[PDB]
Amino acid sequence: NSDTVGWSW
Amino acid sequence: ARPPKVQVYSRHPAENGKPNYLNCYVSGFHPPQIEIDLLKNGEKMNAEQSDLSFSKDWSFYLLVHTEFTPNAVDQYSCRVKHVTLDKPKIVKWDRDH
Amino acid sequence: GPHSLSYFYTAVSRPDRGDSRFIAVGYVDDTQFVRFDNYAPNPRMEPRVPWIQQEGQDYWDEETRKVKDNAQTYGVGLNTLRGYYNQSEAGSHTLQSMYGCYLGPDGLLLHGYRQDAYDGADYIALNEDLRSWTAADMAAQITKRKWEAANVAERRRSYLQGLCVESLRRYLEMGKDTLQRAEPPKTHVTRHPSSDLGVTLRCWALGFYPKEISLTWQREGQDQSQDMELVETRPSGDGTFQKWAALVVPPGEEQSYTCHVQHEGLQEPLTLRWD
């Protein structure tokens, strides 16, 4: 299952 | 930009007239744009390409592969084109290497 | 030794035309199981081994959702990093990530990671404690302060400790017959008389899984391993791997040289010679 990657660099 | 390293080899030890798989492994390159073609006597073979992935050092690797039954006269080779090479890299398949 | 689940994200910018290609690959140890590509029309998370098709459409819809969203996060992030490095919008650039978990004796997380690279170079990494970041350069300090202040570490940690290892256990059950079997090398040595008198001995290892292997050549008088011509470990095309190591030896002295093969699929280390 994927991680949820949502925060800007 | 790092150039690709290219290997051409069979899945099993080559036996003339007996079906096998021809593989063209391309790795260690950056950026990811690349042209990899399996050639049977200079003509592109229909081959599937793996999904783009990378090593721990971020360099990319791809596997181009199709079936083949080698003999004593057919010449197999892998042609690669990348920004790091101004002239294409052709490596010819060798049953011993 | 311990099993792992990992994802590999590659985002590439398009010169002066605002889109970005997003490619994602899923691995359970050394076996690719899923894929996603947003060049395809109506991109979806698609299976690339038989066993993961155990998962019904609910799974595929949800995962498709999450990698589409992740994909636009990486588009924005590409434009951001291009901001930090004061680069033009005329060149294409690359943002890569890899993250994953290793399952420990507990049924819990042994260790886990998340690393980010820009244009093939280290950018930022999560540390072993899963509570702090390592910035590879000046720009990654900008990202680092941002991620500390927002506690992004706890998002990646709760994923690694929760969903990641639970899914890893399920995937290991589903593909029990393929993912849990370590397959040892089939080995043999070939002989190529070739340099007027120098003979080439080549030690092959084919058909093994997982990836990591060791091949070395030894000569009877010397304690250090010999200089050899070694190929990078390469895929067989069917899920196994292969490698060889060779060296040139004087004619008539082949029985002085031994090939040593180490692989966790073998009971004990393997010695092999040109017989």
Residue numbers in the entry:
A (entry chain C): 1 to 9
B (entry chain B): 1 to 97
C (entry chain A): 1 to 275
Give passages from the manuscript.
MHC-I is a cell surface glycoprotein that is responsible for the presentation of both endogenously and exogenously invading pathogen-derived peptide antigens for immune surveillance. Peptides anchor the antigen binding groove (ABG) via interactions between peptide residues and pockets, denoted A–F. Polymorphisms alter the stereo- and electrochemical environment of the pockets, dictating their ability to accommodate different peptide residues, thereby influencing the nature and quantity of the bound peptides (4–6). The key residues, residues at positions 99 and 156 (residues 99 and 156), adopted two distinguishing manners to alter the peptide binding plasticity of SLA-I molecules, and their molecular mechanisms were further demonstrated by the corresponding crystal structures.
To understand the mechanism by which micropolymorphism 99 affected peptide binding, two complexes, SLA-1*13:01 with peptide EW9 (pSLA-1*13:01EW9) and SLA-1*13:01 (F99Y) with peptide NW9 (pSLA-1*13:01 (F99Y)NW9), were crystallized. Only SLA-1*13:01 (F99Y) could bind to peptide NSDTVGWSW (NW9 for short), which was crystallized with SLA-1*04:01 previously. The comparison of the peptides revealed a significant difference that 99Tyr could form a hydrogen bond with the carbon backbone of P3, but 99Phe could not. The hydrogen bond formed between 99Tyr, and the main chain of the P3 residue did not impact the interactions of the sidechain of the P3 residue and the D pocket but significantly enhanced the total binding affinity of NW9. Therefore, the microvariation of 99Tyr/Phe could affect peptide binding but could not change the nature of the D pocket and the preference of the P3 residue. The peptide conformation of pSLA-1*13:01 was almost the same as that of pSLA-1*13:01 (F99Y) (RMSD = 0.175 Å), but it was quite different from that of pSLA-1*04:01 (RMSD = 1.110 Å). The two peptides of pSLA-1*13:01 and pSLA-1*13:01 (F99Y) had similar orientations, especially in P1, P2, P3, and PΩ residues, because these residues are anchored in pockets A, B, D, and F. The stabilities of these pSLA-I complexes were measured via the circular dichroism (CD) spectrum, and the midpoint transition temperature (Tm) values of SLA-1*13:01NW9 and SLA-1*04:01 (F99Y)NW9 were lower than those of SLA-1*13:01 (F99Y)NW9 and SLA-1*04:01NW9. Residue 99 was located on the bottom edge of the D pocket, and 99Tyr could form a hydrogen bond with the main carbon chain of the P3 residue. The CD spectrum verified that this hydrogen bond could dramatically influence the stability of the MHC class I complex.
